[PDB]
Structure formats: C-alpha cells, structure tokens
Amino acid sequence: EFNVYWNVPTFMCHKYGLRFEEVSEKYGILQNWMDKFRGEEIAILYDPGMFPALLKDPNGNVVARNGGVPQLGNLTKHLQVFRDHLINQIPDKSFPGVGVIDFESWRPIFRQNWASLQPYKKLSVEVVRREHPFWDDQRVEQEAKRRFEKYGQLFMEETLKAAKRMRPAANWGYYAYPYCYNLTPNQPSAQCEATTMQENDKMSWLFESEDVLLPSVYLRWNLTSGERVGLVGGRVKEALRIARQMTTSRKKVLPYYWYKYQDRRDTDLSRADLEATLRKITDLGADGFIIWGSSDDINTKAKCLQFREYLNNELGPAVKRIAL
C-alpha cells in the first residue's frame, strides 16, 4: 500500500476559480474534500500552542516567547493554547487523517542546535551562570544541557500526547523527524551524520509515540543528480531504520516532498529529478509521500495558473507513473 497526499495550499487559488480537482480525480493523490487546506486526509499545524522560542523584532530585540528555552517555559500554558488551536483547526473528533505538527524552533538534543539554533545553547548556559557564579565552565554547560534536554523532551512528548488524547484516530508525527543531516557541512556525504544516528536511537520516547515519521527531503539545485537521489535516499533509509525497531505499533514513513529546489525557488523540480527521487522513495519501501508547498509560491492569479500547468504537465504525471 502506497498513498500520496496533497498538502500544497491551493485553497489560495479558489478565489480565481482554480479548485485543483484533478489532483485526486486524475492523478489519484489523496486530497481533503473540496481542496480545503485542513480536512479528513491531512492537516498540518504550523507552530501551534506557545512553544518556547527565541524571536526577533524588525526593531532587533530578541523576544523570548514563553521562556525562550524549554527549561524556562510554562508547559501548562503551552498546552491550553495548543488544545484550543487544535479544537478549531481540526474540529472533527474522529479525524482519521495524517496529523502533522510543524515545530521547528529548536531540536531536543542540545548538541543539534548548531548554526542559527545556537542562541538556544548560549542562553541555556547563561541562565545557569547567573544562578551559580562560582561554578566552573564544565559544571555549567553540563547542567545547561541537562536542563534543556529534560524539558525539550517534556515539551515535545506532552504536546504529542495531547494531540493523541484529543484526536485518537489521527496519525500524528512531527514534521522533519528524524533528522539525518546528510549532504550538509556537519555531514558532507549522502550518509547521515553518525552521532545523529545514535541520538535517534536515544529518542525512542518520540518515535515510539508517533504514528508517522516525516523526514524532509527537499532538494537543492546546487548538487549533482546523484547527490539529489542520495539526499532523499539517506533520509528515508534512516526513517525506515528507526521505524523497524519500533515496538508499540506499525510506523508509517511518509517523507515530506517539495516541488521547488530549496536554494532556487523560481525553479520547479525537473522531470528527470522527479522520476529518480520518487523511484528512490518507492524502491526503499516507504508508505507513500506528502507533497508540500508554500502559499508564497501561489499567491497571485499568474502563479496559480503556472503551478496548475506544472501540476498537469510534470508533477501529476510523474506521481501517477512512478508512485501510483
């Protein structure tokens, strides 16, 4: 069984008379009734609740939403807000579709908050130093990490249990987990970075409670063709690796696929890239995939028409010939 799901925000084009009915009527992609964004097939929640995060004004001041770092946050305040969004966002109690929480503020493993997620390591260390002026470096960092990791797990595990409590027939999963960081500066080959693999085995608390693993397999233009296939492949094997060790239930691997090159959004994926990467997903044995898109790529009549053309001349057909 191999299902493809549509999570492109084409509701943005309904005002111009384009309802994308062909997504499911001709290409067999699972689509929410009436092409609504959220429905009985899929629902994505972008930053729901009041997850602790570090934001920046245009002014330039750092705002610490609900603590900034997990260890400083109000869990119960996050969960009431989360439960009230969810009620409105997915009004149907029997929703049996794929439920996706898109939470990207920080990673739950302290080591993984590199590059732009660094402020989360700094801040965590600073809180401890203010508390304990006489502690030495090593003692401080150790305790910062301990704190961030305990409460990072707590915020993630508790939100997922709330989703499951509220909508018990959905298939919940966090967008982008598990990470692999292959073809990256940290891990510059098509293989996942080795410590990430050990960290993913240590994160059984997340993968055991989710129903679906959702690795992001967006391509980059600045990669050879082999590397583009290797980008997707390494990420899906890792999900599958994790998925076959789970023990509470079957786990579905449904990778998140985008039709634009991430480093070159004006360009849609080539037909050559569509076939090789969708064949990789399918040959690896995943349960299907999810096609996503930004509302900024179809936020005008002109763009909606152009996407529609690509849908019918490239993406749809590829999806129908390979995957279905």
PDB file of C-alpha atoms in Angstrom:
ATOM      1  CA  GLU A   1       0.000   0.000   0.000  1.00  0.00           C
ATOM      2  CA  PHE A   2       1.392   3.340  -1.110  1.00  0.00           C
ATOM      3  CA  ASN A   3      -0.518   6.586  -0.619  1.00  0.00           C
ATOM      4  CA  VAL A   4       0.425  10.072  -1.864  1.00  0.00           C
ATOM      5  CA  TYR A   5      -1.094  13.064  -0.017  1.00  0.00           C
ATOM      6  CA  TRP A   6      -1.575  16.652  -1.129  1.00  0.00           C
ATOM      7  CA  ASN A   7      -0.502  19.353   1.298  1.00  0.00           C
ATOM      8  CA  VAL A   8       0.001  22.210  -1.160  1.00  0.00           C
ATOM      9  CA  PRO A   9      -2.039  25.254  -0.105  1.00  0.00           C
ATOM     10  CA  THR A  10      -4.062  25.521  -3.340  1.00  0.00           C
ATOM     11  CA  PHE A  11      -7.059  26.959  -1.343  1.00  0.00           C
ATOM     12  CA  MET A  12      -5.252  30.237  -2.150  1.00  0.00           C
ATOM     13  CA  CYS A  13      -6.298  29.767  -5.813  1.00  0.00           C
ATOM     14  CA  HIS A  14     -10.005  29.068  -5.147  1.00  0.00           C
ATOM     15  CA  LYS A  15     -10.804  32.785  -5.466  1.00  0.00           C
ATOM     16  CA  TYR A  16      -9.718  32.667  -9.157  1.00  0.00           C
ATOM     17  CA  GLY A  17     -11.838  29.622  -9.946  1.00  0.00           C
ATOM     18  CA  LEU A  18      -8.981  27.041  -9.839  1.00  0.00           C
ATOM     19  CA  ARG A  19     -10.000  24.218  -7.455  1.00  0.00           C
ATOM     20  CA  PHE A  20      -7.308  21.628  -8.369  1.00  0.00           C
ATOM     21  CA  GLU A  21      -9.869  18.757  -8.516  1.00  0.00           C
ATOM     22  CA  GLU A  22      -7.541  16.878 -10.893  1.00  0.00           C
ATOM     23  CA  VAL A  23      -5.092  16.260  -8.014  1.00  0.00           C
ATOM     24  CA  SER A  24      -7.315  13.394  -6.928  1.00  0.00           C
ATOM     25  CA  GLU A  25      -9.663  12.977  -9.928  1.00  0.00           C
ATOM     26  CA  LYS A  26      -6.885  12.250 -12.435  1.00  0.00           C
ATOM     27  CA  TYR A  27      -3.632  11.660 -10.508  1.00  0.00           C
ATOM     28  CA  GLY A  28      -5.030   9.658  -7.553  1.00  0.00           C
ATOM     29  CA  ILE A  29      -3.378  11.797  -4.876  1.00  0.00           C
ATOM     30  CA  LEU A  30      -5.274  11.734  -1.551  1.00  0.00           C
ATOM     31  CA  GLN A  31      -6.863  15.176  -1.191  1.00  0.00           C
ATOM     32  CA  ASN A  32      -9.053  16.802   1.501  1.00  0.00           C
ATOM     33  CA  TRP A  33     -12.671  17.154   0.397  1.00  0.00           C
ATOM     34  CA  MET A  34     -13.227  20.367  -1.607  1.00  0.00           C
ATOM     35  CA  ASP A  35      -9.476  21.031  -1.690  1.00  0.00           C
ATOM     36  CA  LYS A  36      -9.592  22.603   1.790  1.00  0.00           C
ATOM     37  CA  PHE A  37      -6.172  23.033   3.435  1.00  0.00           C
ATOM     38  CA  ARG A  38      -7.065  21.015   6.522  1.00  0.00           C
ATOM     39  CA  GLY A  39      -9.518  18.122   6.183  1.00  0.00           C
ATOM     40  CA  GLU A  40     -10.035  14.401   6.604  1.00  0.00           C
ATOM     41  CA  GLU A  41      -6.867  13.375   4.744  1.00  0.00           C
ATOM     42  CA  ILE A  42      -4.297  15.747   6.155  1.00  0.00           C
ATOM     43  CA  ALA A  43      -3.785  18.651   8.495  1.00  0.00           C
ATOM     44  CA  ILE A  44      -0.559  20.432   9.237  1.00  0.00           C
ATOM     45  CA  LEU A  45      -0.222  22.613  12.345  1.00  0.00           C
ATOM     46  CA  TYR A  46       2.412  25.368  11.953  1.00  0.00           C
ATOM     47  CA  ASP A  47       3.957  26.338  15.339  1.00  0.00           C
ATOM     48  CA  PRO A  48       0.821  25.543  17.378  1.00  0.00           C
ATOM     49  CA  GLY A  49       0.462  26.288  21.083  1.00  0.00           C
ATOM     50  CA  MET A  50       3.049  28.510  22.755  1.00  0.00           C
ATOM     51  CA  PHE A  51       6.249  26.543  22.296  1.00  0.00           C
ATOM     52  CA  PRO A  52       9.177  28.336  23.919  1.00  0.00           C
ATOM     53  CA  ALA A  53      11.251  30.081  21.235  1.00  0.00           C
ATOM     54  CA  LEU A  54      13.562  32.991  20.512  1.00  0.00           C
ATOM     55  CA  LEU A  55      12.135  35.516  18.076  1.00  0.00           C
ATOM     56  CA  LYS A  56      13.348  38.868  16.749  1.00  0.00           C
ATOM     57  CA  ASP A  57      11.535  42.161  16.187  1.00  0.00           C
ATOM     58  CA  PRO A  58      12.288  44.141  12.995  1.00  0.00           C
ATOM     59  CA  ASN A  59      13.487  46.570  15.667  1.00  0.00           C
ATOM     60  CA  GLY A  60      16.032  43.850  16.528  1.00  0.00           C
ATOM     61  CA  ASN A  61      15.188  42.984  20.097  1.00  0.00           C
ATOM     62  CA  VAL A  62      15.168  39.327  20.972  1.00  0.00           C
ATOM     63  CA  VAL A  63      11.800  38.197  22.318  1.00  0.00           C
ATOM     64  CA  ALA A  64      11.713  35.069  24.452  1.00  0.00           C
ATOM     65  CA  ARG A  65       8.260  33.612  23.746  1.00  0.00           C
ATOM     66  CA  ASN A  66       7.214  31.514  26.781  1.00  0.00           C
ATOM     67  CA  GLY A  67      10.683  31.363  28.276  1.00  0.00           C
ATOM     68  CA  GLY A  68      12.851  31.289  25.185  1.00  0.00           C
ATOM     69  CA  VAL A  69      14.308  27.902  26.142  1.00  0.00           C
ATOM     70  CA  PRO A  70      12.307  24.832  27.127  1.00  0.00           C
ATOM     71  CA  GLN A  71      13.624  24.765  30.706  1.00  0.00           C
ATOM     72  CA  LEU A  72      12.220  28.248  31.313  1.00  0.00           C
ATOM     73  CA  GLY A  73       8.761  27.598  29.820  1.00  0.00           C
ATOM     74  CA  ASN A  74       5.225  27.234  31.104  1.00  0.00           C
ATOM     75  CA  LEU A  75       4.150  23.776  29.964  1.00  0.00           C
ATOM     76  CA  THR A  76       0.562  24.096  31.119  1.00  0.00           C
ATOM     77  CA  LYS A  77       0.159  27.475  29.432  1.00  0.00           C
ATOM     78  CA  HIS A  78       1.509  25.932  26.207  1.00  0.00           C
ATOM     79  CA  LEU A  79      -0.919  23.019  26.420  1.00  0.00           C
ATOM     80  CA  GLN A  80      -4.098  25.093  26.943  1.00  0.00           C
ATOM     81  CA  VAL A  81      -3.232  27.203  23.888  1.00  0.00           C
ATOM     82  CA  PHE A  82      -2.334  24.020  21.983  1.00  0.00           C
ATOM     83  CA  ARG A  83      -5.647  22.349  22.901  1.00  0.00           C
ATOM     84  CA  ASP A  84      -7.656  25.422  21.827  1.00  0.00           C
ATOM     85  CA  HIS A  85      -5.958  25.780  18.429  1.00  0.00           C
ATOM     86  CA  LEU A  86      -6.435  22.038  17.782  1.00  0.00           C
ATOM     87  CA  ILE A  87     -10.151  22.222  18.600  1.00  0.00           C
ATOM     88  CA  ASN A  88     -10.603  24.899  15.917  1.00  0.00           C
ATOM     89  CA  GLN A  89      -8.005  23.684  13.429  1.00  0.00           C
ATOM     90  CA  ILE A  90      -9.277  20.067  13.406  1.00  0.00           C
ATOM     91  CA  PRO A  91     -12.918  20.384  14.527  1.00  0.00           C
ATOM     92  CA  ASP A  92     -13.809  16.732  13.862  1.00  0.00           C
ATOM     93  CA  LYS A  93     -13.143  14.406  16.808  1.00  0.00           C
ATOM     94  CA  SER A  94     -12.912  11.351  14.534  1.00  0.00           C
ATOM     95  CA  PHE A  95     -10.360  12.814  12.197  1.00  0.00           C
ATOM     96  CA  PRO A  96      -8.505   9.737  10.945  1.00  0.00           C
ATOM     97  CA  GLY A  97      -6.088  11.505   8.563  1.00  0.00           C
ATOM     98  CA  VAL A  98      -2.374  12.357   8.837  1.00  0.00           C
ATOM     99  CA  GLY A  99      -1.788  14.964  11.558  1.00  0.00           C
ATOM    100  CA  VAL A 100       1.473  16.897  11.316  1.00  0.00           C
ATOM    101  CA  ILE A 101       2.916  19.251  13.934  1.00  0.00           C
ATOM    102  CA  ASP A 102       5.411  21.641  12.322  1.00  0.00           C
ATOM    103  CA  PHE A 103       7.581  22.706  15.262  1.00  0.00           C
ATOM    104  CA  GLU A 104      10.992  23.961  14.198  1.00  0.00           C
ATOM    105  CA  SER A 105      12.085  26.381  16.942  1.00  0.00           C
ATOM    106  CA  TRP A 106      14.804  24.138  18.495  1.00  0.00           C
ATOM    107  CA  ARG A 107      15.846  20.458  18.491  1.00  0.00           C
ATOM    108  CA  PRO A 108      15.520  18.379  21.652  1.00  0.00           C
ATOM    109  CA  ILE A 109      19.167  17.263  21.613  1.00  0.00           C
ATOM    110  CA  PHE A 110      21.394  20.077  22.856  1.00  0.00           C
ATOM    111  CA  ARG A 111      24.247  19.241  20.503  1.00  0.00           C
ATOM    112  CA  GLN A 112      21.971  19.531  17.450  1.00  0.00           C
ATOM    113  CA  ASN A 113      21.109  23.216  17.966  1.00  0.00           C
ATOM    114  CA  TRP A 114      24.013  24.400  15.812  1.00  0.00           C
ATOM    115  CA  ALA A 115      24.430  27.303  13.397  1.00  0.00           C
ATOM    116  CA  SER A 116      21.351  29.538  13.666  1.00  0.00           C
ATOM    117  CA  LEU A 117      19.944  27.443  16.564  1.00  0.00           C
ATOM    118  CA  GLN A 118      22.997  28.430  18.637  1.00  0.00           C
ATOM    119  CA  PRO A 119      21.283  31.198  20.679  1.00  0.00           C
ATOM    120  CA  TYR A 120      19.447  28.354  22.404  1.00  0.00           C
ATOM    121  CA  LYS A 121      22.799  26.953  23.640  1.00  0.00           C
ATOM    122  CA  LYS A 122      24.147  30.349  24.670  1.00  0.00           C
ATOM    123  CA  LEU A 123      21.016  31.327  26.558  1.00  0.00           C
ATOM    124  CA  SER A 124      20.780  27.976  28.320  1.00  0.00           C
ATOM    125  CA  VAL A 125      24.352  28.364  29.539  1.00  0.00           C
ATOM    126  CA  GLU A 126      23.777  31.989  30.572  1.00  0.00           C
ATOM    127  CA  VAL A 127      20.805  31.101  32.795  1.00  0.00           C
ATOM    128  CA  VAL A 128      22.994  28.716  34.811  1.00  0.00           C
ATOM    129  CA  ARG A 129      25.913  31.143  35.141  1.00  0.00           C
ATOM    130  CA  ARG A 130      23.618  33.876  36.583  1.00  0.00           C
ATOM    131  CA  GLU A 131      22.363  31.319  39.129  1.00  0.00           C
ATOM    132  CA  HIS A 132      25.781  29.870  40.001  1.00  0.00           C
ATOM    133  CA  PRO A 133      28.540  32.460  39.704  1.00  0.00           C
ATOM    134  CA  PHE A 134      31.132  30.230  41.338  1.00  0.00           C
ATOM    135  CA  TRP A 135      30.580  27.102  39.204  1.00  0.00           C
ATOM    136  CA  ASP A 136      33.259  26.372  36.606  1.00  0.00           C
ATOM    137  CA  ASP A 137      32.604  26.108  32.861  1.00  0.00           C
ATOM    138  CA  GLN A 138      32.236  22.337  32.618  1.00  0.00           C
ATOM    139  CA  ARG A 139      29.796  22.200  35.523  1.00  0.00           C
ATOM    140  CA  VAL A 140      27.678  24.935  33.916  1.00  0.00           C
ATOM    141  CA  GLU A 141      27.493  23.504  30.400  1.00  0.00           C
ATOM    142  CA  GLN A 142      26.704  20.063  31.761  1.00  0.00           C
ATOM    143  CA  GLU A 143      23.721  21.431  33.700  1.00  0.00           C
ATOM    144  CA  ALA A 144      22.558  23.677  30.885  1.00  0.00           C
ATOM    145  CA  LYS A 145      22.389  20.635  28.591  1.00  0.00           C
ATOM    146  CA  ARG A 146      20.714  18.512  31.295  1.00  0.00           C
ATOM    147  CA  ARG A 147      18.021  21.147  31.761  1.00  0.00           C
ATOM    148  CA  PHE A 148      17.398  21.852  28.071  1.00  0.00           C
ATOM    149  CA  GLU A 149      17.245  18.141  27.278  1.00  0.00           C
ATOM    150  CA  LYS A 150      14.880  17.207  30.101  1.00  0.00           C
ATOM    151  CA  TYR A 151      12.434  19.999  29.260  1.00  0.00           C
ATOM    152  CA  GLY A 152      12.897  19.721  25.477  1.00  0.00           C
ATOM    153  CA  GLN A 153      11.694  16.138  25.741  1.00  0.00           C
ATOM    154  CA  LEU A 154       8.890  17.158  28.097  1.00  0.00           C
ATOM    155  CA  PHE A 155       7.534  19.875  25.780  1.00  0.00           C
ATOM    156  CA  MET A 156       7.593  17.567  22.758  1.00  0.00           C
ATOM    157  CA  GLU A 157       6.275  14.448  24.470  1.00  0.00           C
ATOM    158  CA  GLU A 158       3.467  16.263  26.258  1.00  0.00           C
ATOM    159  CA  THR A 159       2.206  18.070  23.143  1.00  0.00           C
ATOM    160  CA  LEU A 160       2.062  14.827  21.144  1.00  0.00           C
ATOM    161  CA  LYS A 161       0.162  13.062  23.925  1.00  0.00           C
ATOM    162  CA  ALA A 162      -2.279  15.974  23.939  1.00  0.00           C
ATOM    163  CA  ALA A 163      -2.857  15.579  20.193  1.00  0.00           C
ATOM    164  CA  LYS A 164      -3.376  11.853  20.592  1.00  0.00           C
ATOM    165  CA  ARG A 165      -5.731  12.325  23.565  1.00  0.00           C
ATOM    166  CA  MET A 166      -7.816  14.853  21.632  1.00  0.00           C
ATOM    167  CA  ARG A 167      -7.847  13.123  18.209  1.00  0.00           C
ATOM    168  CA  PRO A 168      -7.214   9.466  18.911  1.00  0.00           C
ATOM    169  CA  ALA A 169      -7.735   8.165  15.391  1.00  0.00           C
ATOM    170  CA  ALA A 170      -5.264  10.506  13.680  1.00  0.00           C
ATOM    171  CA  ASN A 171      -1.751   9.577  12.675  1.00  0.00           C
ATOM    172  CA  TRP A 172       0.414  12.152  14.456  1.00  0.00           C
ATOM    173  CA  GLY A 173       4.027  12.895  13.680  1.00  0.00           C
ATOM    174  CA  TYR A 174       6.419  15.799  13.919  1.00  0.00           C
ATOM    175  CA  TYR A 175       7.423  17.444  10.636  1.00  0.00           C
ATOM    176  CA  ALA A 176      11.109  16.626   9.796  1.00  0.00           C
ATOM    177  CA  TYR A 177      11.929  13.850  12.379  1.00  0.00           C
ATOM    178  CA  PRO A 178      14.082  12.040  12.180  1.00  0.00           C
ATOM    179  CA  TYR A 179      16.928  14.293  11.065  1.00  0.00           C
ATOM    180  CA  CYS A 180      19.917  12.837   9.177  1.00  0.00           C
ATOM    181  CA  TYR A 181      21.958  15.932   8.143  1.00  0.00           C
ATOM    182  CA  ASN A 182      23.472  14.177   5.069  1.00  0.00           C
ATOM    183  CA  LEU A 183      24.959  16.450   2.320  1.00  0.00           C
ATOM    184  CA  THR A 184      25.499  19.133   4.952  1.00  0.00           C
ATOM    185  CA  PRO A 185      28.533  20.919   6.413  1.00  0.00           C
ATOM    186  CA  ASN A 186      28.276  18.711   9.505  1.00  0.00           C
ATOM    187  CA  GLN A 187      27.982  15.566   7.353  1.00  0.00           C
ATOM    188  CA  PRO A 188      29.130  16.222   3.781  1.00  0.00           C
ATOM    189  CA  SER A 189      28.313  12.848   2.202  1.00  0.00           C
ATOM    190  CA  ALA A 190      24.992  11.168   1.417  1.00  0.00           C
ATOM    191  CA  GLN A 191      25.190   9.159   4.695  1.00  0.00           C
ATOM    192  CA  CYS A 192      23.527  10.509   7.870  1.00  0.00           C
ATOM    193  CA  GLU A 193      25.909  12.039  10.430  1.00  0.00           C
ATOM    194  CA  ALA A 194      26.851   9.134  12.741  1.00  0.00           C
ATOM    195  CA  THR A 195      26.127  10.839  16.102  1.00  0.00           C
ATOM    196  CA  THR A 196      22.683  11.793  14.826  1.00  0.00           C
ATOM    197  CA  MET A 197      22.021   8.073  14.321  1.00  0.00           C
ATOM    198  CA  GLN A 198      22.963   7.295  17.966  1.00  0.00           C
ATOM    199  CA  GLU A 199      20.866  10.308  19.047  1.00  0.00           C
ATOM    200  CA  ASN A 200      17.887   8.991  17.071  1.00  0.00           C
ATOM    201  CA  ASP A 201      18.107   5.616  18.908  1.00  0.00           C
ATOM    202  CA  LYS A 202      18.140   7.544  22.172  1.00  0.00           C
ATOM    203  CA  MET A 203      14.915   9.313  21.070  1.00  0.00           C
ATOM    204  CA  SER A 204      12.701   6.223  21.313  1.00  0.00           C
ATOM    205  CA  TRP A 205      10.349   8.251  23.503  1.00  0.00           C
ATOM    206  CA  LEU A 206       9.373  10.307  20.403  1.00  0.00           C
ATOM    207  CA  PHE A 207       9.348   7.639  17.652  1.00  0.00           C
ATOM    208  CA  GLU A 208       7.512   5.133  19.872  1.00  0.00           C
ATOM    209  CA  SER A 209       4.640   7.570  20.473  1.00  0.00           C
ATOM    210  CA  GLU A 210       4.318   8.872  16.905  1.00  0.00           C
ATOM    211  CA  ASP A 211       2.385   7.053  14.224  1.00  0.00           C
ATOM    212  CA  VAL A 212       4.289   8.518  11.295  1.00  0.00           C
ATOM    213  CA  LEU A 213       7.906   9.567  10.618  1.00  0.00           C
ATOM    214  CA  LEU A 214       8.215  12.639   8.414  1.00  0.00           C
ATOM    215  CA  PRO A 215      11.723  13.337   7.104  1.00  0.00           C
ATOM    216  CA  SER A 216      12.001  16.458   4.934  1.00  0.00           C
ATOM    217  CA  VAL A 217      13.507  15.557   1.588  1.00  0.00           C
ATOM    218  CA  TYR A 218      13.530  18.935  -0.128  1.00  0.00           C
ATOM    219  CA  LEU A 219      16.124  19.024  -2.960  1.00  0.00           C
ATOM    220  CA  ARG A 220      18.851  21.550  -3.702  1.00  0.00           C
ATOM    221  CA  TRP A 221      19.743  22.645  -7.204  1.00  0.00           C
ATOM    222  CA  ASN A 222      23.396  23.027  -6.271  1.00  0.00           C
ATOM    223  CA  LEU A 223      24.044  19.279  -6.079  1.00  0.00           C
ATOM    224  CA  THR A 224      24.837  16.717  -8.796  1.00  0.00           C
ATOM    225  CA  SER A 225      21.999  14.444  -9.920  1.00  0.00           C
ATOM    226  CA  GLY A 226      23.436  11.533  -7.920  1.00  0.00           C
ATOM    227  CA  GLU A 227      23.594  13.711  -4.819  1.00  0.00           C
ATOM    228  CA  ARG A 228      19.910  14.678  -5.167  1.00  0.00           C
ATOM    229  CA  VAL A 229      18.964  10.984  -5.194  1.00  0.00           C
ATOM    230  CA  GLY A 230      21.351  10.364  -2.267  1.00  0.00           C
ATOM    231  CA  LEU A 231      19.812  13.277  -0.369  1.00  0.00           C
ATOM    232  CA  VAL A 232      16.379  11.633  -0.425  1.00  0.00           C
ATOM    233  CA  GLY A 233      17.696   8.063  -0.040  1.00  0.00           C
ATOM    234  CA  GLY A 234      19.793   8.575   3.120  1.00  0.00           C
ATOM    235  CA  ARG A 235      16.923  10.308   4.910  1.00  0.00           C
ATOM    236  CA  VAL A 236      14.312   7.697   4.101  1.00  0.00           C
ATOM    237  CA  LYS A 237      16.547   4.740   4.996  1.00  0.00           C
ATOM    238  CA  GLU A 238      17.178   6.353   8.389  1.00  0.00           C
ATOM    239  CA  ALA A 239      13.408   6.778   8.956  1.00  0.00           C
ATOM    240  CA  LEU A 240      12.927   3.124   7.925  1.00  0.00           C
ATOM    241  CA  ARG A 241      15.753   2.067  10.245  1.00  0.00           C
ATOM    242  CA  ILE A 242      14.009   3.711  13.182  1.00  0.00           C
ATOM    243  CA  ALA A 243      10.599   2.513  12.000  1.00  0.00           C
ATOM    244  CA  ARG A 244      11.557  -1.196  12.073  1.00  0.00           C
ATOM    245  CA  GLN A 245      12.866  -1.014  15.660  1.00  0.00           C
ATOM    246  CA  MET A 246       9.592   0.446  16.972  1.00  0.00           C
ATOM    247  CA  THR A 247       7.554  -1.863  19.183  1.00  0.00           C
ATOM    248  CA  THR A 248       4.258  -0.272  20.172  1.00  0.00           C
ATOM    249  CA  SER A 249       2.820  -0.363  16.642  1.00  0.00           C
ATOM    250  CA  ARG A 250       3.447  -0.189  12.889  1.00  0.00           C
ATOM    251  CA  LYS A 251       5.036   3.137  11.944  1.00  0.00           C
ATOM    252  CA  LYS A 252       4.437   4.761   8.558  1.00  0.00           C
ATOM    253  CA  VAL A 253       7.245   6.507   6.726  1.00  0.00           C
ATOM    254  CA  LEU A 254       5.788   9.384   4.705  1.00  0.00           C
ATOM    255  CA  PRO A 255       8.538  11.777   3.647  1.00  0.00           C
ATOM    256  CA  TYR A 256       7.785  15.471   3.022  1.00  0.00           C
ATOM    257  CA  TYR A 257       8.431  16.362  -0.620  1.00  0.00           C
ATOM    258  CA  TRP A 258       8.555  19.831  -2.176  1.00  0.00           C
ATOM    259  CA  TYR A 259       8.296  20.615  -5.900  1.00  0.00           C
ATOM    260  CA  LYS A 260      10.709  23.598  -5.762  1.00  0.00           C
ATOM    261  CA  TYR A 261      14.512  23.492  -5.377  1.00  0.00           C
ATOM    262  CA  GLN A 262      15.132  24.938  -1.901  1.00  0.00           C
ATOM    263  CA  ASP A 263      18.106  27.111  -2.945  1.00  0.00           C
ATOM    264  CA  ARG A 264      16.368  28.217  -6.128  1.00  0.00           C
ATOM    265  CA  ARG A 265      12.634  28.627  -5.573  1.00  0.00           C
ATOM    266  CA  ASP A 266      11.906  30.118  -9.031  1.00  0.00           C
ATOM    267  CA  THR A 267      12.708  26.686 -10.480  1.00  0.00           C
ATOM    268  CA  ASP A 268      10.352  23.727 -10.246  1.00  0.00           C
ATOM    269  CA  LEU A 269      11.858  20.252  -9.995  1.00  0.00           C
ATOM    270  CA  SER A 270      12.950  18.879 -13.351  1.00  0.00           C
ATOM    271  CA  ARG A 271      11.094  15.793 -14.679  1.00  0.00           C
ATOM    272  CA  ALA A 272      14.400  13.903 -14.506  1.00  0.00           C
ATOM    273  CA  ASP A 273      14.694  14.812 -10.804  1.00  0.00           C
ATOM    274  CA  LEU A 274      11.030  13.870 -10.112  1.00  0.00           C
ATOM    275  CA  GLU A 275      11.334  10.364 -11.516  1.00  0.00           C
ATOM    276  CA  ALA A 276      14.663   9.429  -9.938  1.00  0.00           C
ATOM    277  CA  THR A 277      13.767  10.754  -6.484  1.00  0.00           C
ATOM    278  CA  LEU A 278      10.183   9.345  -6.434  1.00  0.00           C
ATOM    279  CA  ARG A 279      11.565   5.963  -7.583  1.00  0.00           C
ATOM    280  CA  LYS A 280      14.027   6.099  -4.678  1.00  0.00           C
ATOM    281  CA  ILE A 281      11.227   6.657  -2.216  1.00  0.00           C
ATOM    282  CA  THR A 282       9.184   3.827  -3.730  1.00  0.00           C
ATOM    283  CA  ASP A 283      12.050   1.307  -4.076  1.00  0.00           C
ATOM    284  CA  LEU A 284      13.117   1.965  -0.453  1.00  0.00           C
ATOM    285  CA  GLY A 285       9.706   0.754   0.750  1.00  0.00           C
ATOM    286  CA  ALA A 286       8.145   3.861   2.319  1.00  0.00           C
ATOM    287  CA  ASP A 287       4.337   4.024   2.673  1.00  0.00           C
ATOM    288  CA  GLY A 288       3.945   6.968   0.291  1.00  0.00           C
ATOM    289  CA  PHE A 289       4.929  10.660   0.480  1.00  0.00           C
ATOM    290  CA  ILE A 290       3.488  14.131   1.155  1.00  0.00           C
ATOM    291  CA  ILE A 291       3.666  16.944  -1.393  1.00  0.00           C
ATOM    292  CA  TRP A 292       4.002  20.315   0.316  1.00  0.00           C
ATOM    293  CA  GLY A 293       4.171  23.901  -0.902  1.00  0.00           C
ATOM    294  CA  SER A 294       4.426  27.464   0.337  1.00  0.00           C
ATOM    295  CA  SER A 295       1.487  29.895  -0.009  1.00  0.00           C
ATOM    296  CA  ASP A 296       4.036  32.452  -1.361  1.00  0.00           C
ATOM    297  CA  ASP A 297       4.545  30.348  -4.498  1.00  0.00           C
ATOM    298  CA  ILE A 298       0.865  30.523  -5.486  1.00  0.00           C
ATOM    299  CA  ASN A 299      -0.247  33.853  -4.020  1.00  0.00           C
ATOM    300  CA  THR A 300      -1.380  35.528  -7.263  1.00  0.00           C
ATOM    301  CA  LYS A 301      -3.517  34.524 -10.237  1.00  0.00           C
ATOM    302  CA  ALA A 302      -0.449  34.305 -12.518  1.00  0.00           C
ATOM    303  CA  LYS A 303       1.364  31.932 -10.193  1.00  0.00           C
ATOM    304  CA  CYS A 304      -1.658  29.709  -9.577  1.00  0.00           C
ATOM    305  CA  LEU A 305      -2.047  29.257 -13.337  1.00  0.00           C
ATOM    306  CA  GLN A 306       1.637  28.414 -13.769  1.00  0.00           C
ATOM    307  CA  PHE A 307       1.565  25.865 -10.931  1.00  0.00           C
ATOM    308  CA  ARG A 308      -1.555  24.297 -12.444  1.00  0.00           C
ATOM    309  CA  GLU A 309       0.330  23.915 -15.733  1.00  0.00           C
ATOM    310  CA  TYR A 310       3.257  22.183 -13.936  1.00  0.00           C
ATOM    311  CA  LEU A 311       0.797  20.073 -11.967  1.00  0.00           C
ATOM    312  CA  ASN A 312      -0.737  18.762 -15.211  1.00  0.00           C
ATOM    313  CA  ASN A 313       2.390  18.557 -17.403  1.00  0.00           C
ATOM    314  CA  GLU A 314       5.029  17.308 -14.954  1.00  0.00           C
ATOM    315  CA  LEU A 315       4.304  16.632 -11.290  1.00  0.00           C
ATOM    316  CA  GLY A 316       0.931  14.853 -11.638  1.00  0.00           C
ATOM    317  CA  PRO A 317       2.034  12.529 -14.442  1.00  0.00           C
ATOM    318  CA  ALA A 318       5.297  11.603 -12.662  1.00  0.00           C
ATOM    319  CA  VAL A 319       3.340  10.919  -9.492  1.00  0.00           C
ATOM    320  CA  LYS A 320       0.886   8.784 -11.469  1.00  0.00           C
ATOM    321  CA  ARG A 321       3.500   6.824 -13.465  1.00  0.00           C
ATOM    322  CA  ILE A 322       6.061   6.161 -10.688  1.00  0.00           C
ATOM    323  CA  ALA A 323       4.412   6.214  -7.235  1.00  0.00           C
ATOM    324  CA  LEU A 324       0.886   5.175  -8.231  1.00  0.00           C
TER     325      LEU A 324
END
